[PDB]
Symmetry: C2
Subunit: 398 residues, 2 copies
């Protein structure tokens, strides 16, 4: 049979694509004259599947959707303390208010607004890095997560640099407050090239899935980012991604996201899927009209909402077998707190206060520090009850 | 053996309880003179387990922590449209700004601030309900989720009604804008009694778990609230619960929560656990000092963070058995989009474009509309490939 999801997506493309409201970004010709009759969607699963429909392979500048990735890179290269001194965590609109820098913090509100993205770019490789190093670091982080060397679209870069007064204003104000060290023109040039990196709806979905898994690339299984960093990026995408309309967006859609003025929308739902949507025309507030619409649909039709709990739980225990004098305990899935707690419940549910317990981890896909420590503790306690515990773990995961 | 979690909690009580910073709510004697040397924690699992430590059974007025429950009740009794006309979804501080009502919305920002809670109380049973009916509706919803008839502490009620000018101010302003219909004194009296409902750290954890499961009581498995309503309540708890400090709180703790001035903190992490914490002394912004501290700890030590994905995923497929001419497909766990998509992948991964497929749902605990529809579609498609599909479902769940 054929997989039904890509067909569901194809339907959305036809339904939502029946109309094309809004306008393309007018501030530059390349974006203004862009062909508006394009619309693609792509969903990437944590296990490596990729479902799409429409123009999911058409390249377009990523723009503001580049902010979470450069932020992740900055956190990795400088540490939380160094980045947090220059970039806050308070959600806010794009409209700039100097009073935000006058606060004892002396830092732009968050990493999703232009002022915050400039401060982030300045932090990219280190205090002594060159303009070139920081820019390639932006491209590298975005390429590593997409799974392919990405390129900058210089035509857009140049068109944008010709009308970059607002960003130069933000960078100059930041320098006066000490948030930037290098020149305003330098940091703005890096941020604008960064926004000119070309990507497809599919790149965004893959990229979003890396974030959704805690930093594990779905296609290779390799760890691209420490999980505490992905956790932070997705948190800020949630509280600030859709600006001051983040409250209504969190309630109505529940999918951490960020949109770009070229029509792209990035989505990352932790543990479930990465989303990528493309559609040039923007609504009254600058987000892709249909891109935003498509997200609300995926959320409603499939219940892909942050507040919709989906967890392993007690299924972490494949089955308990009381053969005779010994108990066989088979585990499975991605064991984190939820599963571990359930496995601990199973052990406690045995009267050992049975002469041998065997822990089978063959069906387990992985386990985090929380799960290892918790299960390791349950073993110590079992043994202390004078019970023999043998952990049959093929691929040493414990 | 003994379960390790309640012991971990006991340690936190001893560690965090080594100090007792802040002050109790000074606005009234009953809260001001309350014994500050009390501290309890309780975690409720989706499966019905309840781990606690310290003073988790000491009663205290729920206060502001009552807002998400009355909001859930209002949504159930009036429908989303009627409630949304009077209560917004924009996060904001407790400080009141009339300009928020002057907006074309003419409604307080959200249901977690006093102005929003008053508008919610007014909606409780219906347009013609009596003061008594609405108040008992507040107590009923809170009791149904706690699992026991809860009582109002009239000593607190009276102490609070003697100094209720601020709330009377908010209610009177709301009436001028048409958000309230009944008298200011009436709605304020209901809201204040509502805040005087007595609860324990354990009631909050249980109550929070009902929200965390989509409205399923963990102790009975019965559905107390439609899932779309729980989804909404937890969404607003996330974006507005911890006021304008919700951005830092979402990033640093990642647990949807709401605190009360009596020292209580309510937590509800979708799909994983309900939290209840109690500790009288408040920090500079009105939240339980140690209560807030305890939450940050549970989040860091156990990774109980909203942005930390934990899902069934491919584990939804217990195992695929190709006997000979027929394939046996066994499913398990809570099948929602994530699992269903994985089951669809399994079906597609069969070359049917094998003469019979058998779907075993014995190990499945439940399945939502999204999972049923998706799996039902995979069956239709399999059959269309000229394949025989027999669904062995004991407890008719499909």
């Amino acid at each position: 049979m054929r997989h039904p999801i890509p067909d569901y997506l194809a339907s959305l493309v036809t339904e939502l694509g029946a109309v094309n409201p809004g306008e393309t970004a007018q501030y530059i010709p390349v974006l203004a004259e862009a062909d508006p009759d394009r619309f693609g969607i792509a969903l990437a699963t944590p296990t490596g599947r990729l479902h799409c429909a429409g123009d999911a392979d058409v390249e377009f500048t990523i723009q503001s959707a580049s902010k979470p990735f450069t932020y992740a890179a900055a956190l990795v290269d400088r540490g939380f303390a160094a980045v947090d001194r220059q970039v806050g965590l308070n959600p806010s609109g794009e409209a700039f208010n100097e009073l935000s820098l006058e606060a004892e913090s002396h830092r732009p509100d968050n990493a999703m607004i232009n002022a915050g993205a400039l401060a982030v770019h300045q932090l990219l490789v280190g205090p002594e890095a060159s303009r070139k190093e920081r820019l390639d670091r932006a491209v590298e982080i975005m390429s590593l997560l997409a799974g392919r060397r990405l390129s900058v679209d210089w035509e857009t870069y140049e068109s944008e640099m010709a009308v970059s007064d607002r960003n130069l204003s933000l960078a100059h104000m930041l320098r006066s407050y000490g948030v930037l060290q290098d020149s305003a023109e330098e940091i703005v040039a890096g941020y604008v090239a960064q926004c000119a990196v070309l990507v497809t709806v599919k790149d965004l979905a893959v990229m979003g899935a890396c974030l959704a898994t805690g930093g594990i690339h779905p296609m290779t299984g390799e760890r691209m980012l420490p999980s505490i960093v992905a956790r932070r990026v997705v948190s800020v995408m949630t509280s600030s991604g859709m600006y001051d309309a983040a409250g209504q967006w969190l309630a109505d859609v529940g999918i951490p996201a960020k949109s770009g003025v070229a029509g792209g929308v990035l989505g990352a739902l932790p543990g479930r899927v990465g989303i990528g949507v493309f559609s040039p025309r923007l609504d009254e507030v600058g987000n892709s009209a249909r891109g935003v619409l498509a997200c609300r649909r995926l959320s409603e039709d499939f219940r892909l909402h942050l507040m919709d709990g989906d967890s392993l739980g007690g299924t972490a225990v494949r089955f308990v077998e009381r053969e005779g004098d010994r108990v066989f305990l088979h585990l499975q899935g991605v064991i984190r707190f939820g599963g571990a707690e359930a496995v601990l419940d199973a052990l406690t549910d045995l009267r050992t206060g049975i002469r041998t317990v065997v822990l089978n981890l063959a069906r387990v896909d992985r386990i985090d520090d929380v799960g290892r420590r918790l299960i390791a503790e349950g073993v110590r306690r079992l043994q202390a009850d004078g019970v023999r515990v043998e952990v049959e773990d093929p691929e040493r995961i414990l």
